[PDB]
Structures are given as structure tokens and as C-alpha cells.
Amino acid sequence: RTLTGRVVSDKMDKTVTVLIERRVKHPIYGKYVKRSTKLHAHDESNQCRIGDLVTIRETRPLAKTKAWTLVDIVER
Amino acid sequence: RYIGPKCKLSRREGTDLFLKSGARALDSKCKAENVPGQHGQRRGRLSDYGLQLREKQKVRRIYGVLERQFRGYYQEASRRKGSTGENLLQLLECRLDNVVYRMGFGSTRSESRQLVSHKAITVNGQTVNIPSYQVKAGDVVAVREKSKNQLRIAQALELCGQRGRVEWVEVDLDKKAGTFKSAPARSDLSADINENLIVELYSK
Amino acid sequence: ANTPSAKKRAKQAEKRRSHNASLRSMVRTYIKNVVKAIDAKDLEKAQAAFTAAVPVIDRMADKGIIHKNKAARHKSRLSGHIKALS
Amino acid sequence: MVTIRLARGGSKKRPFYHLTVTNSRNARDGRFVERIGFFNPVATGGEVRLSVDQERATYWLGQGAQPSERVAQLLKDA
RNA sequence: GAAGAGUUUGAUCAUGGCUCAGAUUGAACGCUGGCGGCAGGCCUAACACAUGCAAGUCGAGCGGAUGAAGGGAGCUUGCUCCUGGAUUCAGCGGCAGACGGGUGAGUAAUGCCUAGGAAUCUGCCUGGUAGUGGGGGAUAACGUCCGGAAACGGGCGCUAAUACCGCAUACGUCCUGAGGGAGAAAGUGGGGGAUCUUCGGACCUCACGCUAUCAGAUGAGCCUAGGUCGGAUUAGCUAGUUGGUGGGGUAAAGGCCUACCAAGGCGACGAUCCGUAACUGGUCUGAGAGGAUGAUCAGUCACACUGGAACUGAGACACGGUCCAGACUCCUACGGGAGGCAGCAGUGGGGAAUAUUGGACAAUGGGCGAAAGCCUGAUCCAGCCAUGCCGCGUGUCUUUAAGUUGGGAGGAAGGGCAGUAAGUUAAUACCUUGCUGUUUUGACGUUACCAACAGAAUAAGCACCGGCUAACUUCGUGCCAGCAGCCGCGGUAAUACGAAGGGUGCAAGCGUUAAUCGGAAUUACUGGGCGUAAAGCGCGCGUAGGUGGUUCAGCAAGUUGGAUGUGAAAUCCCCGGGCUCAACCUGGGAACUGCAUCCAAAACUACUGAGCU
């Protein structure tokens, strides 16, 4: 219930996209690779700038390609 | 089962095979002194894989078994836990085709395999007619009560102490009914086989 | 071909469609006049016009031509803007 | 529609049942909700007849499932 | 739990490809065939389809059609006026037809699979909560007319209700959530002693129905993350696209639809375009890693001549529905009509190649029904085919199979009935129902299976034999004719080619054509290479990225352990139980290396901070 990513684009109101990165293993190659995942997060008040770190929550979808809202700015 | 004339199969091996036709001898009139085939007045190059063949192609020619049936019996040796060679000849001695003669109701396996199909050898008060039943340690072995005055059953009771006792059964000759006591190890067998060398004819 | 078990419901469907087309249109003309009432901005007929409509929006919903929460939205959409006329 | 029902496994002229809890939206032998214990009317020595467990059989009767016709008079063998 | 040979050379060694042993299939083909049990059988044309059948059910939901009987009146047993009610069933109406069934065309991603998430409906089912009153207008059948050879159309006129529309009525249920407004239903049959009378009705009483809601079960719908095919000789794509609000709309969230505001969105972790293909549990070869792969079986998806579209309904954008368009086909008496086998048979036609115009709802289901039951090409089960997978038989004086005869279980749960007891009953009066014991009856495959009888009468074939396969004379033929997987063989004593003459492989099958993996370390993560065999760009600057000296502290993303839900069932792996045995069948578990959540850990990595040289 906690997904964390760094802010990469904020030029739209009430909506922000982050890179929820991870590092997981390749199945037949063994080397742990990074796999970037670019979610969309909904902001209620639009207070997130590029380079911020946030956590998010799942609910009913807020738009097309958006089903995750803003919980809290963890750090900056 | 293999059929036909059988004096010509006693010649390749050198052993008596327990394949005969009467009650006095074997390979004593059917001229066993050579190595048959197409042309066999000369020998040469008698070595491993063709000997591993002549091992299994002897064991096939004794026990009434086909390679449909016999290389499925190597399949249970790996299904067996450990000691695959003697555990092959376990099911050839839990075989009913051999143990009618290992008791001695028939003259050979060629009369043992035959009469059990002709509704002679029951197992435990039921009606079994297969030459492949797997006798457990501790059933009776009886004969159906219409082949008792079959007198070629009485033409097999003369070779009990003449082909030697097996020392693994306890039989009643008056009833013509026996009892398989327990399974053998590799001390109760004839010494003409190589049990973990039939195994080696599996990968090549 | 087709069966008279289905040929009977050939009449049983399109005739039933004709009754369900009118009663469905008897709903949405009452809602149009209480949107014409808001678009005329006259509360003095708008209050009397959708209280004629609410006994029709759910009476059709009660008999299974439409669903009962389609009524529940349109009873909450029209009231939320008649209140805005103030 | 929810129903406890005899369902043919086994071989031809060798019936074996599962007593599936099904939906009556599916086939007899596919997409069961639950298998409670089995049945075997060719039962001979060593084979148990029916593995009916009343721990779960109460629940579908409690949640509203029904015997078909025969399933009522297998519970009558108790 | 892992076996390699042969072949480059005069010989060697190394790099490196070829061909070979094996096991397999939905099998063909060439051969020759005795039987049983379980199986499986258009892989090609999602090609066209004659013919029959694949979902009709209900009269105890309603009007209306037809008259079993029986008791009588006349004529005198021929007949009808009646009296009656047995019965059927085309027209309305409920429900089902959205299931079972089939096929894999489309789809490269929201389809499938694994995990999770909430903003929803669900007829019949199951628990309650409240309720079935009073009316009104039509409408088919039916009557006739018109058009038509028929099929069918469409003009008025009749009548019904468990068909429809108001009115009454509101425990929830909806709106406003202040107050208030709003909107439901249908009756039928088995009965019943007291009062109203035509104790037909009324009221009483259960049974099936009916309604307004809640909780659940059962389905079904959204949303997110993950992965899911080949290409850069496809690098830019995108405008309703990405957000924002107003509204509009879906059972339900949502640019889904909409207007206007802004310029965002996707993509080198491979976008978009292009070719390809249902997916998965799984399957096949494998020491495993894997690789190949989706026939029977089961889940989900998808389609119904082709395309668009809604309608009705709880549920469809509906395979044996309607509408429109297209292609095709068919009947015409030229007026007008009809059809959609990827449903079971079956037919062409294609192809290497694949079955019967079967028997019955007796079992299991369903679909209607108060119940009886009524239908089902789903199913149970049969012909056809060595197509596998097992067993079995063709004799060493037995008679198994097969065949003759006599026997002989198990598949049946119950239904009828007429007592017997029960508990709802206002009245165990009475119906209706569950119990009990007896009687009556119903098996598609009609048998498996037991026990007699005549007699070896009814049963073997195939391929090879130069090597590394320890099966290995000659006769005919003469660099001819030919065989063969790799070498090669044949150019005149031929173990290599054609017979005979013998053996051998394993057997009702044996072989070779084809495809898959293997050995193949021959795409090397496990587990390979690059001075000269193939292979270092001619070298730099450096973007993403891969990896990153050093110390304490912190974080807990990777890492590590346990916890819990699963990872469906099947398949497999062991122990079993059964078919007389084996397949096959199941019971039990094992297995399912996976997924997220949860807490615990801090050596190392990332990240965070102060540093150290």
C-alpha cells in the first residue's frame, strides 16, 4: 500500500507522473536489473515539483491512465 | 512366448537353458557342438556389447518374455530404490510363468505358461489366467479342480529332487497345491547371468 | 430455419419494444422541460414542473423499463441546480 | 442455481462421482465451486463408498444450495 | 542425476561444421493381421453445403376451440335435444432460449496468467423485514374481406387474464438528506364447520405464485502492477491525444460522451509501424537449466456467411433472434417468397491423411412443471479405424481367446399407491408435506461374468546381415543393373547390388518418409570464444547505462529467515484401493522453485549525510 517514486514532470494541474524505480532479477541471466515504472499520481492541491519524492495510494480511477492519488510529500 | 523347434536355441549359449522336451536330458541328441547361424564353423571377436546383447538375448529366450515386456521390467528397476540388477530378477521370480515350474507342476516353462492360460493355476481362490501375475510373499498356489487327473501334471513330479529343490517353497504334493513363501535374493539363482551387465545395455 | 418458439417471441419482443419506447420517451420529455425551466431561469414554474416529473421518473423505474438508480441520479441532478437558482 | 450434484468421472462402464458443488451454469465435469467427497457405486473390498464431509456440506445448504434428486438420498445413507 | 561414434590429413593436433545411435505424434505411407479393456480419430478449405435431427415447456396462469363416459326424456335402442365432464393444443401469457454444444478466424495487449483493488448489478436460490386492496383501457384466437396457386401478408369488427395502465397503500428503498415529496403487487389450484347467501363467492387454511428491500451465496462488470512474438533494412508517434472544470451519460469509476481552458502525453527498460499467434494450467525432449510447444482434458478469451446496429430480457449487442447492408444460394404459378452445418450424422471439395443420415433419456445434468412427467445429436453408450496404450492369443495329450449352449451380478437414486406416524392447523378437522413398512413397475449398451461342449480344427509377419553393431557361403549380374543415413559398394572368386540358402532384430506388427528435443560447450546464465583458424571499430571526447577507493551512522529498495492467503481441479511424483493382471481408475499426500502483504535482521549494494587520501 506504499509505492514511492521521484517526480519527473509537473507542468499539468492536479496530476503528476513519477518514476517508481525498482531493481529486480533477470530470470535466466541472474543479474539484478533496474526496471523503471512511470505511474501517474493525482494531486489534490498541486504542490509537487520536478525532483520531489512522494508516496501514493490506490483507489478508484481518477481519469484514464490514472488510478493513484497523492498521500504525502515524503522528502525533497 | 517363443515358438517353433527349440534344439537350435540350446546351442548359442552353452547352458542347459531349462528348455527341454522330455525327462532324461538336454542337448544330448540335438547335436550341440558348434555355434550356429548363417555360417559358424569359425569364431572370432567375442567382446563387450555383443556379449551384453547375448546376455539379455539369453534372458529373453528363457523367461517367455518380449522386449515389449522385458524392457518395461528395467523401468521398474529405476522405480525400485537401489540395486537394480537383482531387482530385475525379483519380478521374474514373482512372475507366475516361472514359478509353476519352480514348484514343478509342468514339465518346463513351455507347459507352465500354457496351462495357466488353460485355467489351471489359481492364485488365492480366484480365477487368474495371465502369465504375468505378481505373487506376493504369502499366498497359496493351487490348481483348478478339473486338471487334477491331467496326467502330464503327474509327468512333472519326478524332477523335484532331480532338477534339485529350490528351498524357497512349502508345497503339498497330495493336493497338487503350493505356497510361495518369500522373494529370493541373488543367492537363489543360477550363476549363468550377469545382472548388472544386462543393465549396461540401456544407453547403447 | 427458425422455430415457432422463437417466432412467437418475434412478436413478443418488437411489440414490447413499442410500449417501452413510448414510456421511455415519456420520462425524458419531463426532464427536458425542467431543464428548459432552468434555462429560462424562472423558479416560479420550475418548482411546479419537476414535482410533476418525479412521480414519472421512478414510476417507470419501479416497473423495470429503466433501472431505479438512473432515477436516483436525475432526481439529484435537477435538484442540485434548482437550488443554484438563488 | 447453486447445486450439489453427481458428476461422472471414471471410465466408460466404470462410474465414479465427485459430488461437485456447481452453479448449473457450467457442464457437469467443469468449473465446480467445490468438491466435497466422492462416490463409487462399483465399490468392492477396500474401497470406501463415499467421503461425504459434513463440515463443508452444511455450508452450501446453509448458503442455499440444493440436492438434485439423488443427492438427497445419499445424505439419507447416514 | 549427464556414455558418444563415424567423417578434412601421407599421418598428427587444434579450431570447427556435417551425418549417426535414442526417445517421441492428433500421425501418414509400404507391408500383414487373431482378440479384449480404456482411449483417441479434418493437423488442410473460419470452403460450399441436399437431407433428417441439435430447446419446447406449461391447461393447477387466462379467454376461446372438442365432447370421454354416466344418469334420463322421446322416437324405440339406429339417432340427436340435452345433462355433463374425461381429454387434448394451434393462438395469448410466464420462464428458458445469454446454458449445454462447436470452432480458433480476429487480438502483441488489457486478451491470458499471477497477485491485489472498489465505484456495481444478479431471474430462479437462501435467511429475515413490510405487503397481495381497489379499479380502468386494450388485445390475439375467433368472424369475414382483400392480395396470393401455395407460402403468407393487413382492413375493420368481437372477448379474456398470473398481459397492461392509473388510483389506494410505504417497515426499508430513492431524492432533498433541515422539513417534505415520491413510487409497489396477480392471482390460480388441493381443501374447509359456525354466521352472509347461488356455506359457486366471502372468510379460514396451507401449496405454487406476486411485490417492496436488506444481508448472503452464486454468477457477471470495471480499475491497477507484473510478465507475455519476431524485426531499427520500422525512431519518432500523438490532437480527444494528455490533464482541468461545467454539464451530459453507464447498473457502476473513467475524455467514455461533450463544450471551452491550458500544452501536455508516449518512447531507446524498444514507442509507433511491420510480420506472426488465442492464452494458461500444461505438454514433449532434457542431468537440470532449458528448448520446443497449446490435438483429447479443465479455466478464461473470441467468433457464428461478411460488416454495422440495437431490441427484448436479471443476464446478449443473441450460433438453430430481429433489423440493415454485402456476397452467395434457392422456390416461383413472375403475384411474391425463403436460407446460413465452425450443432450431431452426412455430402462434395481440398488434401499424405481421419469415422455412423446409429440406440435411448435407464444413469448424470439441465430446460420448463404443484406434481406426474415433457424435450436435449449435451450426455450415457454403440458401429467404423491396429491410430496409439496395455494385456492376450497362434499348441507341449490340456482348450484360453474365438464360437455353440445353459446360467449370471452391478449399473435403481426413486416414482405410483394406501395405509402408518408426524407439524404447521383456529379446527394433527381436512388438504398439503416429510417420515416410516409393504405392494406395483422402469436398463440404451444385454451384457460383463460363471459353467459345459467339438478338436490343435480358425492364427506370423516384417526388415535387414560392407561397418562402430561380433545377425555376416555361394548363385545371377560385371563402372552394367543398382543400393545407401556416414564411409562407400559395383570396373569378372561381389560378406556392400539383384535372388535363392540361412540367421538375427521384436513381434500383429515391422520398417522409412516427415516433424520435435537430445548428443550440440554447435549462441556456452549454468557453460565457449577473438596474435596467426571465424572474430579488436583506426583510434578518441564522452550521453543513457553497467559497475564503482575509503570510515562511522542511518534507511530497509535488492539481499536473509519465519508467518498467512494462495499457487484452481486435472496432469505428474510416492503410498495405495480396483478391473483375474497391466494400462486405466481414483483415495491420501507430496509437488507446484511462484506472488503480494506482515513482522524480525543489518555483513555487503543502492540511496541519505558528515568525512578519510
Coordinates of C-alpha atoms in Angstrom, one line a residue, chain B residues 63-194:
Chain B
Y63 CA 11.5 -66.4 -19.4
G64 CA 8.9 -66.3 -22.2
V65 CA 9.3 -62.5 -22.3
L66 CA 9.3 -60.0 -25.2
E67 CA 11.1 -56.7 -25.3
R68 CA 7.7 -55.0 -25.1
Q69 CA 7.5 -56.8 -21.8
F70 CA 11.1 -57.0 -20.6
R71 CA 12.5 -53.5 -21.1
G72 CA 9.4 -52.4 -19.2
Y73 CA 10.9 -54.5 -16.4
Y74 CA 14.1 -52.4 -16.4
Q75 CA 11.7 -49.5 -16.0
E76 CA 10.7 -50.7 -12.5
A77 CA 14.4 -51.3 -11.6
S78 CA 14.8 -47.5 -11.6
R79 CA 11.4 -47.3 -9.9
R80 CA 13.0 -49.7 -7.4
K81 CA 15.2 -48.0 -4.8
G82 CA 18.8 -49.3 -5.2
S83 CA 20.5 -52.5 -6.5
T84 CA 18.9 -52.6 -10.0
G85 CA 20.4 -55.9 -11.2
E86 CA 19.0 -58.4 -8.7
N87 CA 15.8 -56.3 -8.5
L88 CA 15.2 -57.1 -12.2
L89 CA 15.0 -60.8 -11.5
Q90 CA 12.7 -60.2 -8.5
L91 CA 9.7 -59.7 -10.7
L92 CA 10.9 -62.6 -12.9
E93 CA 10.5 -64.7 -9.8
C94 CA 7.3 -63.0 -8.7
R95 CA 6.5 -64.0 -12.3
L96 CA 4.0 -66.8 -12.4
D97 CA 5.4 -68.2 -15.7
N98 CA 8.5 -69.4 -14.0
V99 CA 7.2 -70.4 -10.5
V100 CA 4.8 -73.0 -11.8
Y101 CA 8.0 -74.9 -12.8
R102 CA 9.9 -73.6 -9.8
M103 CA 7.3 -75.5 -7.9
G104 CA 7.1 -78.1 -10.7
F105 CA 3.5 -78.5 -11.9
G106 CA 4.5 -78.6 -15.6
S107 CA 7.5 -80.1 -17.5
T108 CA 9.0 -76.7 -18.3
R109 CA 8.0 -73.1 -18.7
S110 CA 6.6 -74.1 -22.1
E111 CA 4.0 -76.2 -20.2
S112 CA 3.9 -73.7 -17.3
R113 CA 2.9 -70.7 -19.3
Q114 CA 0.4 -72.7 -21.3
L115 CA -1.7 -74.4 -18.7
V116 CA -2.2 -71.2 -16.6
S117 CA -3.9 -69.8 -19.8
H118 CA -5.9 -73.0 -19.9
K119 CA -7.5 -72.1 -16.5
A120 CA -5.3 -74.3 -14.2
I121 CA -3.3 -72.2 -11.8
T122 CA -5.4 -70.1 -9.5
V123 CA -3.9 -67.7 -7.0
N124 CA -6.0 -67.3 -3.9
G125 CA -9.4 -68.8 -4.6
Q126 CA -9.9 -66.6 -7.7
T127 CA -9.6 -67.3 -11.4
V128 CA -6.3 -65.9 -12.8
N129 CA -5.2 -66.8 -16.4
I130 CA -2.3 -64.4 -17.0
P131 CA 1.4 -65.4 -17.3
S132 CA 2.3 -62.1 -15.6
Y133 CA 0.8 -62.2 -12.1
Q134 CA 2.9 -60.8 -9.3
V135 CA 2.8 -63.2 -6.5
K136 CA 3.0 -61.6 -3.1
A137 CA 5.0 -63.1 -0.2
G138 CA 2.4 -65.3 1.4
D139 CA -0.4 -66.5 -0.9
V140 CA -1.3 -70.1 -1.6
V141 CA -0.8 -71.5 -5.1
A142 CA -3.4 -74.1 -6.1
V143 CA -4.8 -75.8 -9.2
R144 CA -8.4 -75.7 -10.5
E145 CA -10.2 -78.9 -9.5
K146 CA -10.6 -80.3 -13.0
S147 CA -6.9 -80.5 -14.1
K148 CA -6.0 -83.0 -11.3
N149 CA -6.3 -86.2 -13.3
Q150 CA -4.5 -84.4 -16.1
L151 CA -1.6 -86.9 -16.1
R152 CA 1.0 -84.7 -17.6
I153 CA 0.8 -82.8 -14.3
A154 CA 2.0 -86.1 -12.9
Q155 CA 4.7 -86.2 -15.6
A156 CA 6.4 -83.3 -13.7
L157 CA 6.7 -84.6 -10.2
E158 CA 9.7 -86.8 -10.9
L159 CA 12.2 -83.9 -11.3
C160 CA 11.7 -82.3 -7.9
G161 CA 14.9 -83.8 -6.4
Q162 CA 16.3 -84.5 -9.8
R163 CA 16.4 -80.9 -11.0
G164 CA 17.1 -80.1 -7.4
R165 CA 14.9 -78.4 -4.7
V166 CA 14.6 -74.7 -4.8
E167 CA 14.4 -74.3 -0.9
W168 CA 12.0 -71.4 -1.1
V169 CA 8.6 -73.1 -1.2
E170 CA 6.4 -75.4 1.0
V171 CA 4.2 -77.5 -1.2
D172 CA 1.7 -80.3 -0.7
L173 CA 2.1 -83.0 -3.4
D174 CA -1.1 -84.8 -2.4
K175 CA -3.4 -81.9 -3.2
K176 CA -1.2 -80.6 -6.0
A177 CA -1.2 -77.2 -4.3
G178 CA 1.7 -75.0 -3.3
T179 CA 2.6 -71.8 -1.4
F180 CA 5.2 -69.1 -2.4
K181 CA 7.0 -68.3 0.8
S182 CA 9.2 -65.3 0.1
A183 CA 11.1 -63.4 -2.6
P184 CA 14.6 -64.5 -3.4
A185 CA 17.9 -62.6 -3.3
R186 CA 20.9 -63.2 -5.5
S187 CA 21.8 -66.5 -3.8
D188 CA 18.8 -68.5 -5.1
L189 CA 19.6 -68.1 -8.8
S190 CA 21.6 -70.0 -11.4
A191 CA 25.0 -68.5 -11.9
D192 CA 24.9 -68.0 -15.7
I193 CA 23.5 -64.5 -15.7
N194 CA 25.2 -61.1 -15.2

